[PDB]
């Protein structure tokens, strides 16, 4: 219920999401998060096409890196230099031009100071 990942401030975590590939509707994949009591917040999104978009929220720029492995149909989020304000549930979702579309289960992450 309250079960999740626990990271010490300054530590790192990697997430992954399955990304079947580009359809007529969607041209990428990414993550958003929702902290207790707050609205959903964009985190990052990446295009299936190499070189098209790689978007980051201002709050994670320089600390998080999104990457794709199309040969494995996967995308990854490397979350470095984690801080307490990164505590949230992290959700993967298909992207269209960078925006994320959730058409209904996340990964709960607690970062201590």
């Amino acid at each position: 219920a309250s079960g999740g990942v626990f990271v010490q401030s300054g530590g790192s975590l990697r997430l992954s999401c399955a990304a079947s590939g580009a359809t007529s509707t969607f041209d990428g994949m990414g993550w958003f998060r929702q902290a207790p009591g707050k609205e959903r917040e964009f985190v990052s999104a990446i295009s299936y096409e190499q070189g098209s978009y790689t978007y980051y929220a201002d709050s994670v720029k320089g600390r998080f890196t999104i990457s794709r492995d199309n040969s494995k149909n996967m995308v990854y989020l490397q979350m470095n230099s984690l801080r307490a304000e990164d505590t949230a549930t992290y959700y993967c979702a298909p992207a269209y031009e960078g925006d994320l579309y959730a058409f209904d289960q996340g990964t709960q992450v607690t970062v201590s100071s």
């Binding site: 964009f42 999104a45 980051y56 960078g98 925006d99 994320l100 579309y101 959730a102 058409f103």
Partner: peptide, 10 residues
């Protein structure tokens, strides 16, 4: 029938 959109950065 319904969708949640989380917009990329402005």
């Amino acid at each position: 029938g319904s969708v949640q959109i989380v917009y990329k950065p402005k």
